[PDB]
């Protein structure tokens with residue numbers, strides 16, 4: 001599967017039936033469908049300050065650049081503990097640098113960060129949780145161009161070493177909470193899906209209200225550093241526009257922790 | 260049995276209709292990064308759009324759409340070839356969400372959208388033949404906003420009660436179809452795309468006018484509540500609502516006849 005050509009998102013449902021099922025993500029977050037919910041208490045990010053004496057694997061899997069995370073990292077404040085498994089990003093391209101997955105009032109942000117977690121109280125690993133009730137929780141950070149962000153550069157400084165599918169690099173531990181925006185108490189919450197195959201409708205989404213900033217140069221590095229092909233592929237593919245189009249979301253609300 | 264909702268909805272169209280998962284798909288979001296002025300985009304001329312009020316034109320519910328058939332003496336000029344009209348139809352949302360345009364502008368949906376489908380009658384004998392040929396089809400799109408009552412659109416909408424179910428047909432007296440077009444038709448977006456329904460053939464030259472028209476809340480509610488996708492005797496009725504495809508990746512630039 002890919003984000004373009006004949007194996008792109010309109011054809012995912014062939015091999016991955018859930019991609020044509022219910023509860024699909026991402027969606028447009030717009031005023032008519034928001035409803036304040038006082039039950040939406042602040043999350044607490046535990047174990048996010050990764051040991052600087054450890055190394056964490058960054059990979060290009062051809063679909064995505066991901067950073068593996070340890071299972072002692074978890075969200076507190078949901079009904080079950082959700083333990084981290086990985087983070088990754090989505091972006092557009094230099095000619096149209098608006099590649100977030102979620103949109104707000106119809107508008108894309110430059111990019112979007114996802115921190116994938118699974119219900120480790122109920123299930124042994126994310127793979128097993130992914131097709132299960134209450135299985136997954138993803139945190140989403142909207143990214144816009146602005147000042148240079150030293151924390152995001154702790155990932156982005158490694159991207160050259162994972163330019164091609166199959167390449168890997170080690171990242172020394174840093175405080176992952178530095179990638180989150182201001183006022184993480186303010187968020188959107190809804191039940192949806194993975195935004196890539198297999199598109200399982202098992203994700204509790206938390207999209208923070210406020211974006212982060214990265215510089216013009218950091219965004220361009222993200223959009224130009226990575227291919228979606230192996231190094232020896234005679235027909236290379238840039239890793240660009242790696243976001244899913246928004247999905248219909250009818251007769252449903254997105255709950256907000258803010259009014 | 261493709262639909263706009265459920266296991267036969269748009270993310271599954273490609274399973275039966277391969278072009279729906281191919282290149283050059285429509286509709287799209289019209290936004291600054293992908294627009295470019297093209298001074299060659301001169302005005303279209305609309306010929307034979309003033310249909311006689313003493314003639315009548317067939318309105319049909321085919322289960323997927325309600326279309327008004329148009330006569331082949333109705334043409335657009337300006338395109339390399341002459342294109343003849345074949346039908347017009349609309350796309351809309353639902354009573355609780357009157358946002359059902361197909362194209363979006365800077366990420367927003369309009370209330371509804373009108374499409375006037377033409378085929379290259381210089382080259383082909385009918386629109387079905389044209390539809391699998393390069394630039395075989397030309398579709399004009401009018402964005403529709405909730406606003407004032409529109410008597411011209413009501414010349415269509417006042418018959419919808421009478422084609423509520425799949426297979427039903429009604430006659431509409433002729434009127435001037437140019438009354439359905441917005442102000443300043445010289446200002447438009449132009450791009451190469453596709454049918455927005457199965458079989459999604461990538462054979463359409465799209466012209467989306469820059470300016471919307473208005474129809475009233477009451478006209479929208481009538482449109483959004485009058486029609487069914489199913490036969491009159493079907494025991495599992497489906498309302499004809501939310502009949503718009505999501506916008507597609509733009510794989511393209513959109514050319515504008517206006518520079519600002």
Ligand SMILES: NS(=O)(=O)c1c(F)c(F)c2c(c1F)N(Cc1ccccc1)CCS2(=O)=O
Nearest residue numbers: 061063064114116126127130138194195196
């Ligand atoms: N946006 S997202 O969070 O849905 C998302 C994504 F963008 C991906 F690129 C990928 C995801 C993924 F979630 N997965 C899928 C998955 C997660 C956890 C348990 C099983 C499978 C892993 C394969 S991947 O192609 O690297």
Ligand SMILES: NS(=O)(=O)c1c(F)c(F)c2c(c1F)N(Cc1ccccc1)CCS2(=O)=O
Nearest residue numbers: 323324374376386387390398453454455456
């Ligand atoms: N928006 S659109 O213009 O692409 C569009 C549409 F919305 C439809 F609902 C339908 C279309 C159609 F174009 N056709 C398709 C076609 C046209 C002309 C030659 C052959 C096939 C007829 C079948 S339909 O399902 O009534």
Ligand SMILES: [Zn+2]
Nearest residue numbers: 088090114195
């Ligand atoms: Zn993601």
Ligand SMILES: [Zn+2]
Nearest residue numbers: 348350374455
């Ligand atoms: Zn149409």
